[PDB]
């Protein structure tokens, strides 16, 4: 979710895997 | 070659069965085998 | 009473009334013992399974992916090392052993659950695993031709530790430590709430862990605070805490939670943490063998924390020795091997994915690349691993015994201050407290005590003697630190009535580990030895009790830095620890079997052993001496035999001393008569004055060997040539250089002389027009090549003892190079063949002596076995790649040059006493100027009295009196032996000299008349006295010895000034004051620099003297200049002196011209800073303001 996590890879994978 | 016969180089044997078909190329080919070192990299203490 | 050949040659007087209950344990045992357990298994020890074999067994079974392939470990075979340690170091190769393991794979139909793998792969083969480094009997490792030592590491033991910060009341904490992996922690709160965290994270109630699993009121407060409804909710919360912003998965959280604490590879206690946890909770129900965490264990830890909050229990002490354990180098090697094995197993699982073969063998899948790299990386780059100090034999022993808490899993230098630096009560029996670095690392070295020993669990243990019914038993036992606290131990100094019963009703002993006064009945144990608390290095110093602790520590650190002299001199006053230190260190040769010397020469020793009194043996053994061996400290090492032809010898005797050893005794100093009066201000503070007789007599002269290596590399423009054909070089300069271009062996080289000549080509010279006109006027051609020969640095003078050359690989050797290599090989084999024949000739002579005694089949294969070794030695020289090394690709050739230069003590040199008094020589005086006694014998050195009052080093004065007494005893012996040299009277004189004082009763009667004459000649210079560190002789005994010498009962004696010959008012104490020279020469410290190369990035001078050096200017110095107000000095130094490129050239031209001009437009460093800022968005530029 929108946890403010700095790393881009975690943010990108969440959208890609949907 | 190293695992099968143990010997690390056997460079003549290495040229014995290769598709490269060159001997000068292997001598020049392995010359650029070292990445540039980092200047800021530490040397342990080394006089600090 | 010497009882030994080394003791027989010289007899040393001994003092003290304490009996020797137990001999000292082997000093190098800790380093040697750890490696053996890893590489060896002993049935008696109970170490049935080697650690390396257990590591292979644990991860061997994979069953990759239903491929009908099974991996099973069968056996491990270790290959013999290709080169011996002596051969490996000279070649520069690292001593190594090949590791081979047997893998069996079972294959079959691989159907769906039927006969998958029971009918195939019945063939198994050994697969090479990697190369394992080997440890010499000295417990040292040779890497890349360099000897290295790995320091032992002290780390907190795995277990459960409870501690409370005082910041708030009731703030107890619970910590669980795994051998590897994350460790959970529990923290109490002021409200009494309980929080659980893993290493680091958001604070959460400890109840969440219990929820995931399934007079107490704390649970009720904690349960309401957490809003978690179900275990699934608790697991999701834990996953969210571990990773933030990551969506939860239904099965992802369950695998992660079990894996963190429930994976055996991921989490293990090592069998130490589990053992401590079970003892702490006292529960045997949980399986000790399983190191994995359990729900019951966590509930028990929470219960213990609640009990501590209630107030039943005791907080643990981190500083306590029992909590801390010492990790050997082998355990670290085992961990590296395990990491490599894990990587190899992952590769094997991936390797099975591609198959292109029929009846494939289980050799292709195994990959040895990962294991070799990790172990090599650890040994070469290991922080704990470092070059062993070669300054002296004592230094090598000190470094190996050293244990460092620093390194991986270790406290940072600045992180821990004022806690671990202090000495704990348990430290008395485990670590000597007088030895530590005076630097910031001080209090971390924790040098191991001599009697300190390591238990299998890694906890240090101390030997003690039990007492029964108030009577001391002779039984010796080792007590653990935790066990020791409960018992009360009395000191060994306490006297006995001869029934082993303490005479004194009240004695000083430690009952709680703190010294206190208690009755003799409560005492349960006695110390094995007085010197047990002190470290082996500390015991060397005499009169240790009289000296202050800080001064003693300074003296102990200084003694290890002592530099060996050409002739070793045994100290007149010694604790007697020197003989043990020399024997334990492998710098001397000890005969394996009792035998009579057959031939002795200064290159090797030949000994014949009698079979009647010895176990069956070859009947001949050969020992090879080492001559002028180089050292890391550049100190020459050589071995000289003390044996004689037809001399009876026994096992354990020293055939010949090697490095810094005299007659089996280590000597780092020379005895010099020392006065104690201020002279002419030459020693206002710590300055020392030398008579100069020592300089003339070579009393303090040392030999240093310098190795210079010249290498040839192939540049893009051309291949450089080491041939000595360089234009612009005169024949006289090259006259020393040989036709081959290598300097002749044994030829003295002046500073800056050419050792080797090389030429490197240059292109695009682009000579300026004036240079072009000069070439045209003289018809001078411009060289397309430049010369870069190797030359000795200025101020250095030496001779070339040895020359080493390595040829190219895969290229036929030239007739000069090829012929030279063949000649060298033949000479080594030819000298060996004649030398091997000489041993064979000696064996044949022995057979002729035993020809009547049956030799037909007794030694039939003995000569054949010797021949095989000779053939291998010939093969090993030709066994090389032809360069003697791989050579690193792109390197055409390399040459090694060895130069040895003698060094003599000079002004500005530093001399440090054993007592810790240190000084730097200020001047050398004439013999007549130095003050002399009424006899007229000169005083070699004069010391300042004021310094001794300021620092309580009273031990030095006592040693000087003892030295004076020894000097007096020697003169009487010289007078007795000067005339009427007969054994019968000499025996009586010796009985008076030795049996006059002390209860030692040397019983000189055993020595024959021939031995007596040699002993008297040896004692002419002085009579040796040995004093126990805490058992030192009292003042009255020394006064009686002075009376026997005939000197007055005082150290001070009348003296006369040499210049005026008039006696000084007041007598002056004279002592031998045995002294050593520290390794701090002023030759390399001069660092004179005028103009030097500048740093490329900052255009600034290099520092440290590595190239041209130069002194950096401190910021504080700038503050002092500002206080002075000398702006002109400050402005000039900053710009022209350092980074002004325009200014430096202009300044140099002006100085040569002598005209006066100054240019300081700007400093280059400021421009570089502006460019760095300019790259960023912020803009910095110069401006003119009219406002």
From TrEMBL, chain A:
Subcellular location: Cytoplasm
Function noted in UniProt: Sigma factors are initiation factors that promote the attachment of RNA polymerase to specific initiation sites and are then released. This sigma factor is the primary sigma factor during exponential growth.
Subunit text: Interacts transiently with the RNA polymerase catalytic core.
Similarity comment text for this entry: Belongs to the sigma-70 factor family. RpoD/SigA subfamily.
Protein name: RNA polymerase sigma factor RpoD
Protein species of origin: Francisella tularensis subsp. holarctica
Span covered, complete protein: 80 to 97 of 577
